[model samples]
Target chain A: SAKTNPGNFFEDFRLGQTIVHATPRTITEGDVALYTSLYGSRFALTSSTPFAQSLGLERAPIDSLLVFHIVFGKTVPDISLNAIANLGYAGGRFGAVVYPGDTLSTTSKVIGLRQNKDGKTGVVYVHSVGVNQWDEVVLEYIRWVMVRKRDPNAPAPETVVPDLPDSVPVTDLTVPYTVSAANYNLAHAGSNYLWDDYEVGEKIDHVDGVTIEEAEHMQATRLYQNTARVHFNLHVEREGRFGRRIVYGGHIISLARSLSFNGLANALSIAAINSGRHTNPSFAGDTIYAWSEILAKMAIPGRTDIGALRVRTVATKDRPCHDFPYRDAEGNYDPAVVLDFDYTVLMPRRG
Target chain B: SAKTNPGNFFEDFRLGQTIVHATPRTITEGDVALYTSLYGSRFALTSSTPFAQSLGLERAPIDSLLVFHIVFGKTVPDISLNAIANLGYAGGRFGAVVYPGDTLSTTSKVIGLRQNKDGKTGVVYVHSVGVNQWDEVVLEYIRWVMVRKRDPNAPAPETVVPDLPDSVPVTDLTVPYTVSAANYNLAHAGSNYLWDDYEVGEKIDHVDGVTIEEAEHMQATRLYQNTARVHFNLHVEREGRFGRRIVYGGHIISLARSLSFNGLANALSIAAINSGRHTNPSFAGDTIYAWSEILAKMAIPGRTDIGALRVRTVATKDRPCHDFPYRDAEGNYDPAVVLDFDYTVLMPRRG
Candidate 1:
């Protein structure tokens, strides 16, 4: 039985080994539709065919995080199935705007490891990078997870903690290599704004909301081929202790991100994903909404027609994004603020 | 302006309207995959997962009525695009459970209509249902039709009739509902038991099946969607003679019935909608499925724990329903059995 691993177990990793992920998936438009319905995304550029071209894209681009997760899902069989918990994420950057029809792959370099006190588990840190079909770097992030050890009898490995930053330095984010307004169609692209026009604190709440449905959510869960038991099999769950199926968290993130397309029409490409947090559990009946803020703006080297905008997007339920709600009380997330994402998008230069 | 919908003529009806429809769809895993891939449904009750625990379910639900239309789709546009007669239905039921997810729709609801003869067109109807996602209805019905004139200038009318019974009586049914054993890990819900255990007849409302896909049934009509330009552009359809894209009747039937799953599962959904025979012409593959009956029962609401079943279910590509399918072989349908289904299902009681 020397076939490629159906999956990995606790005994497979070493402290410093690099694992390249497999199965490059070719993404499509149906995926875009699912992303919108599932997360209630209404960003003008992503939903309105006219809005996308106005931002100077050939067509709507896939979510930067979708690219990240696709790559991550590819790695699960090779790295995390037996994982206990996802510890942290850092040092990520996006190198290009991924349009539909692109194939993507992922690889991870092991940076550090530490055996836990329990003697039956250990923490593994790795820097995962994503690449599209054209050899373009789409995204990169460093994350660690606690995993089980197969043999308690095995000697413990040396402790090693690689120096990892808490968050990506706001200035180090990469600008997308190609973005221009020359071929942009304002009517179809959905916006008239160019780079340099957005202020650092300006917040644009996308106007649109879609109530998630059971069928829509399930279709999306299967598209990812993630196959987590929590998503399907209600009969199994109904009789189990929890008694219900769980919607995937990634499904929510992509939905909200797609929904953030309205006001940020000119922001065509995702330059990076700084951090992410799924505030609360979402189910079939929830309605989703999103908003974005101009965190900063920068220029792309060797590109004359485009610049980049660092933006943080947030998601909420059955609420408008007008004020962009966040933390309150002891630190519990507001029902309206389901996600707070830090990322970068490529926009065009103003006249 | 005079180019589309040549329509049927008055002389076209000779007491009985018999129009054979065109267009046939070959369903594939793509349809099945796309539904789940896009909807994000992972109901272990339909697909597979570890925790499946239900009293009667096994494998995935296969979308009870998506199967019905695969059988009904084969007869639209060509058969009833100009239909006016609707009749009643009888003697139909589901037989073997279907699992094959292949391409299939309808072709039978053509024998149901008759004509009002003053040299004008008449009605037509046919009973049609499906087997598995494969293309078989466990059973079918007998319906009729009524049609209209191609040229209004032609003449007056005379009407004929086809006899239809009130309902398929209980003893007439072959298969009965099977009672499934409930266990902690009962693979899926609802898929066991047999007829002998059932009371003479009973009704069970299966509790869940969602609507069908827009892109799905449309793709099912791959060529039909483009057979004429109007099918492709709603904008064009609005300006054309019809004034709107006629939602395929079969789709409405399927969608309505798929929703029926909410209160009906014991009839084990449908074994087949033998002869979906579209009463009126339908377009736009919308969501649709069905419900069942127990005209009489042997009595075991107690002891045998097995309930007898006699049922009726209807489907519509898009229209909603609180009632169901009906029609006669000469093409005159009861206002209710716009679907007018007559079929059998096997339910189980305590052995």
Candidate 2:
């Protein structure tokens, strides 16, 4: 029985405690192929090894979202096994470019905790770091989740919510030493947009919709190894909130990132995950559509080959984004709204 | 018609038949990443190149189960396109530890056959061998399946059931010459248990349950390039026997092996598959649980650093395994039972 882990509940947390997550996963070329097959993404920098090598990368780094999801998956069991819901993410940053054959492991520190007014649940915050075999950090992020308590009457721990930043500062972004936009082939990258081609406040509707397939979504979640009961276990989930399996939010995030390629084709590397919210539950059969608004632009210090774009990507299920149906006057999201994602990316500058 | 393969029927087989399975898959870091993501397996030797290299391996060999799944997937069209059920497996052996970038191909021979009493179906036996790009066999196994008849009144072939061993002898097991358990690190390996720690007849309940997700299973099935209609195309499957999608049997096998890591953490390489059965149909939302019974153990000849374990892993849907529920009267399986798998694994011996 000791060999089996039941995972952690609300009462299992202590502020400042460190948890070493299990399962160090090695990234392979097969992941790139599957990511393309599942999302239909066409970012050439990652699509071809020779193209990436020409651009000075060791190999096409696995897609940023793919790396993010894999790293995020490693923290699920330790931080959110009994979670009621994933609340939000903030201050996420990619430290180094990940190459195939690199093994990823994770460690999380309990940074904050708060018992809910309702006696049966509480919120927990953790800062998780994903590292390569060389012990170099690949990614780091802060996340909070609502977790269920084993006993309703258990005394609550002292609340210790850590103050966190709303976004990763531009000064903190790490550009890969191998990245160079000097030879970026617009035709090969699948889009011709340069850093100067877009204006702030401009909106781009990614005019594509992929009807989610049940088998594919589950497979994607499994690929992340996220074992949330809400996504599987129909026998019990059939009696739960939705009476059906809910699609993992990360699946929607990845799909949205894939869709953004139609407009942001040249935005190659994801510099940071500033903030994100799963606005609504998405299930299989929902057709996902996305739209993006250019929120801000900043010049990377000492970098003439690339610039950073701060963008807001919104995704919806069974609803097109032509009208950008998101939050209304009362600041309430539409039922079809599935994601509100804020992230920054590095794009090739115009000559 | 060329886009789809209708597969072979029982009447199409001939004595000493040779069928080359199509689709050569190049395994990569992505496969390794996806396998870990899907299975949550943590055999460190396969998790990192340095760890594997320290143990005298080229790179972390792809998980034996992953290698088996890809090879078996290739055979589905040539061998089981019209299959009613995959009946059993025997005399399966692993020859070489597969590394990323190695392309795998499989070829099978129709070694034996027998018509069932019912004129509508018959059993076909085939010995399948999987080889890498250099034409070295990576795996070989014998399996039989019940296939559908093109016509109920079709002429039947002479009855012949090739004799097969109940288990692969230890002497026949191939230990990759690169495996040197002398440098095995129990801490990083995630388990202190060794080949000698387990006893014959002992049972282990791998106490993790992954509710199957529809998208993930379908994606996995496709990754193997299997075009089984029952696993995809819900528009047609919705009208079929189960009135829904059927989870690939290999998905459950992979899941079960992943779960086994909880107790058999140090059982690194699978040596052979002695026998196996897909006892029932599994669908998305089914929560899979598994348990393994140690049937036999053998010390590798001239090797004290490693040994072999013969294991029978049984997986169930939405059923816990405190009682080890399995076959019932007349040899029928419990409705909840899904897989009855038998295999042997090579594990490091304590130094």
Candidate 3:
């Protein structure tokens, strides 16, 4: 009876408390195949081994978000089991290229704590690092979550909101490939548009819609071993806010990213997860549609063969994205808007 | 437009013709992880490496049905894209142990062809063999389907129905493990019932039900690279008999096999796929339940540590299996019955 994890509460936080997440999972090709089927991701670097070897890599790297999902999933048991709201994400950096067979795990250090004025909930911010078996850091990010207090009478700790960056520094992005990139085959890559072809502020509609299902989200969340009762157990969630099981927000992100392949096929490797907001909840049978806007393009300090593009991918449920539905005039999200994801991806540059 | 595969129709069949299926897919840990997530399989042999090394194997082998699905998926484009009904599966045998990084491919030989009495459809029987990169056979099975004719006026081929065995021969089954096995870990296996505990004609109710969903079956089917029209296209199937997309038969088989873990956890390695009949169709939202009957117990020629149990695992939709529902008194299958599968599994015996 003592072995079960009830999850951490608002009062369980210390300013410098460090927690190590359990269940180190080894990444496998089976996972890759399933990801492909789930999201229909066709990025050349992650999809074909030959394409990767051509870029001076031994093999294809697993998708960046997959590494994030694995690390993020591990932290759920300790960080957000009793979370009232997942507030914000920032300054996330991809440090290493994760490959199949590499075992990855996570550790989180509490950096900021703020007791809310309501006295029943507070925001907890933490810096989490995910490392491979060799201690090679795969991902490092900051997350702030509003968690419920087990006891409203518990004494509140002094508030400390740690200073954080608005976005990951462009120079700090990891280049998993060589400096002198080889000929990126347009035929095999399936896209002729290189980094130079895209301009900032250009919006591209990802023309595809996939209806979500309960089993898909539930199984995938369990695959990551995230036993958040809200994603599965309809018996418990039937009484909650949504009145039913809510689809995991990450599922919406994956769907949006997968849909972006039509417009951003040449955006090869994800370099940074700058920020993301789960604007609204999505449910089973809601057809997800997405669109992406190239926000900024930056040339790496030294590399001329490749560049990075910061893109905002917005996902909406039931509404098609031909005329992208995102937010209302007053800065509130539209009911259909499910996710707003800002990330940077590396792409080949035309000489 | 001409590049599209029209699929092999009833009039296109040639006796003794061999068809090579495309897409040589490499197995990976990602796929293995997805399979684990999909079915929540806990077979000791496939779950942990130490558990597998405890036996005389180098590593955990992929599930027997995974190999079957991979091999079977390839033949669908060429054999069953125009199929009317997936009639029967027989003479199926599992061969080489498939591990991550093994690229498997398939080829099928036409064995029998018969025009239907209605003259609009005909039965085509094919013997399909899936081999690894080294040409080591992984799975070989015979499938018969009633396929629609492209032209009703097309000349019919001479009727030739190949004789298939009622069950796979015990002598011909492949053993991918060593004869002198190490100490079987009952503590970790999670099952106490061994070969000695199971008697002939005894029934074991697999006490779990998983509700099927469209995305689950459709994505899984596509994961195997199956392009059969009925599985994904709602437009095509909407006017068809079922009025909507029909769940792939193999999905039910997997659900049934996954549910059997509670009762047949130690029945680990599948030795033979004796026979299988999709007696009825399964649809999304149908809660699937299954039960197993020990049909026969046979001692492998010289092996004392392990024995084979021939099992009949029947799956039904929205029907509990505490009473073990199957056929009526007149031998007609109950309407709820979806799958009737006969297979043999290798289980440890008490000396």
Candidate 4:
């Protein structure tokens, strides 16, 4: 059986072409528990009820990046199963934070394409968006991947550059959630931040990282029963196919989201899955780290106790995603940037 | 913190002692699913609904050995955690077959004891019985183990060897279940044997074996949430006062029971866990096989579709259980014998 149903080859992609990914999954607490145990993530922002209370949260909000990766995982079977490389991400933003009991779906539009010198493979740029059952965009992002063309003699598709912002303007960010410091008590939740405290564009470095193992990812993938053989069956890999079972993109996304809990403890509900890129591949035995920055804030329509913020969370392996990391001089991803995700979160207002 | 809590040291043993194991567990289908996915054991007898119907069974009788292991695993913390070597089995029988919703508890009476040459560890033989909520014996078996001494200077106890029967005579076996196999189909279930087909002393080589993993065992142990650290943490070893996570002796037992389906497709509910022995320390990565013999056969009360067969099911790793595999020339359990379990299984008799 073919590993994936390859829908359209790289040469078939055109600038402005739209691609709809398949499979909508309803996320549950079972998925949440598996994510926590699999990644060794203790993010109070996502697991503990008592810890969230001090920051004015009623319960742990589902991990924002978990939604992003799931949406991304669905696209692989159709779009990138034969991908040579995942290139870059831009215009990514999370419209809302996700919670348990939410079903999510994704669709993408080809925004850019570039022909590599080898003529055997070309870069395909796509702007992808994830929508929940309510049809609201939860996440949207622009990404480009190096994909192999089925035939080198096939006419080349016209090249187009996607206009994207280098960084989401900090002032344009939506702080949809914030809590008043006057009512805050760090005693139970083990944190000291409150709504009125954080400055726009402030960067928080979540210090802890965990080493991943082959068994860990296999357990997570199987727990979901998400059967993508590229992540399992070592015996099959002996034939030298995709090189190895790729660690699931969702696995790393969850790791990064969990690591963001340190300073973003108050952020809740992934109102949107703005955008993401698994910039580089991560394998077993890699240490993962996370860092986040506030991009924007929004005031809810009639709520006085809550505010929302658009933030970017990035994950890296063996290297830290701190010091405001990004792609390096050769148009290559920075070694410290394995995952770059943008999304919206809620915190309580000082009022 | 102790890796395992050794209930009593060798000095505490008495020839005619009885210890009631604590923490009885109610097993469920979730355990069945976890065991299946963890070991990837897709035995139609335990998992496939349509397949079991072909074998003259109402949905696959829960793997006979899994029923035994779950009961046995509950006793490890109290009995074998500190034992040196498992000795032997004798005079075992089954009372009733267990189902998914059953709760089980165990009681073991020390039947014999012998001091070893080192005098630091002594072999203690116990006859253990598993009972369901109705107080009916589900299974009973006799096993001996070398237990460590709490005090090397303690005086040796009197030597005792329990007089035992050669095999549990089939005429004494009981079959409590009376479900009809009226729609039994031989095609889908992948078996040709029916109630009247199997004869006494029938030897079967259960064809497949699955190597175990630490995560699989931990997930299983925890799903039952058995809190034994040897099965939980990788940093510890069995030889360190407590033995290695002892592979939850039930895991091997269940592995073999599920494997038995290749030949004993209609062996429905386990009548009893007559007796079980962790013949050798089984760690992760050992492939397990089961060989069974019909010790006895009995008619079901008022049931025409099913009969009972008292069985001796042995689970060995990386080795087959045929040729009456048990102890070798040296009189020790062959290194391959991971489990020696005597149980009763119900088979559909010819209508």
Candidate 5:
């Protein structure tokens, strides 16, 4: 009998199958410290414990992307271990504020599956929920990946793709009960723009780039317990298509999100990942630059304390995002474009 | 006279001296996440909360190797800042299962001294223990390092080599009473191998590799608050040895152990470190592969559900371990070999 798992394949899925993923991890201050070191993140709310408490939080909350990555990593063993590519994500939401010492676990329900015409691959759609030790759900998201088949001759499952929303409605957005910026300090928060100050269609360059290091990205991937061999096993990769390990897509997402903080410091929590696509693969040593375009702004139905901004965050390798790099004339992503992330974030409103 | 630590040299050690290391860290989920990210560890006992609870633990305990690194890192400034090389380790033991919210501090006592014939470098031995906020010892280990003298003409300390055990006796090993395998799930545990299955002298190639990255290792080192200059400050290191940033030795240890999970998945917790050595320096982009040779096995005094295995785990750079590669007959390790780790682990026994 084999001691190690080969992980699930295209044939392994059935609609509505639920997986109680492994690794319920307890978060800690060391994690926060590591996050800061890795990304050089300086969001005051998540940086200083005293700063967070001043805004009515118990202590600084872990970066939202960090929480998302952990929750997302739990599903990889079952969902994307044999993935050809991660297609996109949608309908994501963060529930409660996660604090240090809180234990997190995740479970995923297979929502859609469709074998490709080639019969050698298929797309898997899963809804994964991450919850605290108390069984309170903290994060929920839908993600789809292109997974390889165990056998080319295996029978194809019925095609069933569930409809997903273009964006999370303002009415359904969650605002932490304790979140209030009544005493929000612009200088300390690192940005002067309030939720109401930004108009729709505004673009911010974010003006910072971090050269990705191989060790840093690999560590970030492993931290999620994502066992995708392509990210770690150099021997396998040395002979594979890329001839070297490709950086984990989430690593770029994080780098881009952290970079976005320079221009949108008060965009506190990621409320929804309306959609996302890793347009191209990134390798080590590439300097990552990001820019964000505000797609829409909406006021919460009953909350005067916070609002939501739908934004398209674009990340490019080596090239700066000041040009708002995207698709070329052929409707294909620019060679330098690595990520096209469409998400909504929560920001405090100005008095 | 300097406010910053210059680190103690050979002339600073006295047999009966004690040193309290600084920077008490409160461990968190973020640290756990980073450890997993950096190492890709999948030991269910450390990864999952419910799994640990089913085994009667308080959530998933942080990996003992991680705890060891953080604890050992703290002593670097006070003990090894001016050291030439770390020599060996012995009589190490895990005293408790450290969880999130626990603050850890360390203290070490000098135990031995031996000046080299060159009158430039000498060996210094110390026994260090890491304790939680309540002062409950969480880990203890004895290590010796070769420290450079501030001046070549510095007088030699009394020659001494403290009597050290070749291995920590099983009877003296501390197994958390809360650790029981009554319902151990091998599938979820990521391995079906048991303590009784591994034979003495049996060597197993771990067969995984992780290429080091600069940012990742530096962040890990800083998270432990290890302020060793050689590991950071690329500007200073451009003209230093190796001509680039050197990956911290502890980073290699954690990577090697994580890679070992491929073959030794059920080896849950580290019991003791008989000895370890950084055979060669490793840098960014160097792929690390590991293999383990079982050294000995022992029955726990009062436990039947768990047993211990002493193993030699070797890590090599950019090299696979199928041939069980190690030192040459000339008494020097292969150029690619980066680490030689000898340690003992607690493993669940099969029915």
Candidate 6:
């Protein structure tokens, strides 16, 4: 036990302490293929080189969610190895365009920590940022998790709660992208719905469902280099709480995003994930479905070629999203609901 | 159904007729990452850029099997969409070293056709070749599949069985690779064993087992663009055969090869696939295991820096390879047996 990493317990964390994660991965097209295969996401921005080139880019960039997962994967070993549950996320933002051959590494800073009244558990909040080899930020996010304390007898540290934004401000949004409206091919993009075409309060049902499997999530999780024990080690999970491996919440997010393609076909790249919550646990064999509502529509400060859409996507298990199963009056999620995600995406705007 | 591709029937192929496969793919590092996550392949040659540069390369090339799968994936719609069974492989050879960003496309030529004793089916043999963006041959192979006939009354073409060698001759082996023995890091390779350290007839049991899942095979197949219905259409398969989606056989080959990494850690790159057969059907939930026997060792003519080894690898389902469970009385495969593969690999020599 002396040399082993039991993982950082709640009591071991200190305010403002920075943890550098391991395995700086070189992002490649191989990951792009697997991500595409896993989700069936066909957003043209990441799918074709010519389409991307037509928009003034030399080549297609990797999906923003891929950047998120790659960065998030680096944090698991240091931050959430013994987490009881992932509480929530906030102020998530995408930075530079992640191209193939770029190596990404992540570092997390402890922003907040509070001991639970039970004395055995505490909430650990961290702000993690991923940077490419060039030291350009690729992604950053704030997430808090409830983790167990290795020594229940250890005294609780002073609780320090860090300020976090409810959502990323539109003015602060970064676009390393420039679009050429004339060069943009609607036929190649697969959808003609531009950002201006969408109205606030509009809701769309993404009518597709995909069944999850243990191997799929496990492989996807490992692909991110996320080594959470509960997601693997079925031998241990068989006797544990769920009696089976739990799907990583991120996998569900990708599934929902892919499903949304039918309705949001032109929602090219994610600008920010304002806030998100995994309302329920998902297991292998659980089929997933998703629906989205246009929460807001915003202009990109001065840009006219591209605009942003603030969308809220809700995912459910073993149920269709045609009617959009969601929350009850008391604010409790439906039994079938798995994820409630709020995010912003970059889309073409009419010139 | 009229406009849909019902897929090419046995009668559709003519001697010397060629089929150009669809969807030329630009391989990327994202795909490489996913492949690593899926198989956990640790061949240092493809694992690190510095390691590859150490051995006289610009960067690590993609795995040989990844190239094979990508090339093989293109032929599915044209050659194997209606296949009843993949019968066998032969005379397979690899040519250029495939690197990320290289676009690869496949084309196949009909070489032989034979009507089975049963009037409903026939064997179609085709030779397929994959070339990179530079028009360099990346890989080529010969495979035959049993396909159904749309019309039983259709006349069969002249049977022309192209001669194939029992094994790829050493002189015919292509080495798109060169070695810098002084710069080779045995530690990074994870094994000190080289070509000279292995003897013919040596058997090694790869002691790892991985359970398959429907989603995994489907994703992998889709990643390769191998859209065989039997591997994806669960609804149709539930009422037809197996009551579940069938696992793609190529996936089994990958699993076996990844498992062999335990003992063949220094076997860096695959040079050729001489012959192969899927002895039985495999489905989701089947745990796969494998073992290998060194068949022959040969020197790459005029090259002291590298050597070649012909290896016979057998994969079984739900059974470990410790005893190397293989043939029973009368030379019949055991019920648990699934894949019988023979291939050649390149390894470093004791410079």
Better of 3 and 6 by lDDT: 6
- Which stretches in model 2 have alpha-carbon errors above 4 Å? A48-56, A177-193, A196-204, A320-334, B1-47, B69-84, B101-127, B131-137, B146-163, B177-248, B282-287, B296-304, B318-323, B328-331, B349-351
What's model 2's lDDT at A55?
70
* Candidate 1 chain A least-lDDT 10 residues: A1-10
Give lDDT per model, in order.
0.54, 0.84, 0.83, 0.65, 0.83, 0.85
Error of 1 at A274 (Å): 0.8
**Residue range B234-318, candidate 4, lDDT tens digits:** 5577456545555766666666765665567566556555567777777875656668777777775566677777778888777
Q: DockQ score for model 6, please?
A: 0.15
- Cα misplacement distance, residue A266 of candidate 5 (Å): 5.6
Error of 3 at B332 (Å): 22
Q: What is the C-alpha RMSD of each candidate to the true structure, in Å?
A: 14.8, 4.3, 8.3, 10.7, 4.7, 8.5
The DockQ leader among the candidates is 2
Worst 10 residues of 2 chain A by lDDT: A177-186
Model 6 alpha-carbon drift over 4 Å, by segment: A320-322, B1-24, B29-100, B103-216, B225-242, B246-351
lDDT of 1 by residue, B208-278 (tens): 33333444444434423323333346777778665656544444454444334333323344432333444
- Write one digit per residue (lDDT tens) for candidate 2, span B1-351: 588767889988987999988888999777776776576666666776777777778877888888988999999988998998889999998987799889999999999998899788999999999999999999999999999998888899998889999988899999883445556656556666777778788888876667776767876787778777789979988998789999889889988988887788788878889989999999977889898899988889988888898899999999844467788646898888999999998888876
lDDT of 5 by residue, B1-351 (tens): 767757888897888899998889999776776777667787778777777778778877888988999999999998888887788888888887898779999999999999998888999999998999998999898999999899888788888788998888898888873445557666566665798888888888776677776777887798788877789988988998678987889889888888887788888878788889899988877878888888888888888888999989999987844387787648978887889999989898865
* lDDT, candidate 4, A1-351, per-residue tens: 111133567887877767665435455564576566666655456777554555544556666556666666656644665577666666556666566656666788887888778899988878788887678877777777788889998888777777777654434444433455565545444556655577778888888888887777766654443434456544344345555556777688777766776787655455544567787777778898888888776666666676667778888787743465667648777876778877666666665
Tell me how far the alpha carbon of residue B29 in candidate 1 is from the true structure, in angstroms, after superposition: 12
Backbone Cα, N, C clashes tallied per candidate: 199, 18, 14, 59, 16, 15
Question: Order of candidates by lDDT, top first?
Answer: 6, 2, 5, 3, 4, 1
Q: Candidate 3 residues A61-164, lDDT tens each? A: 88888888889999999999898778889989999889888999899999999999999999999999999999999999999999999999999999999987
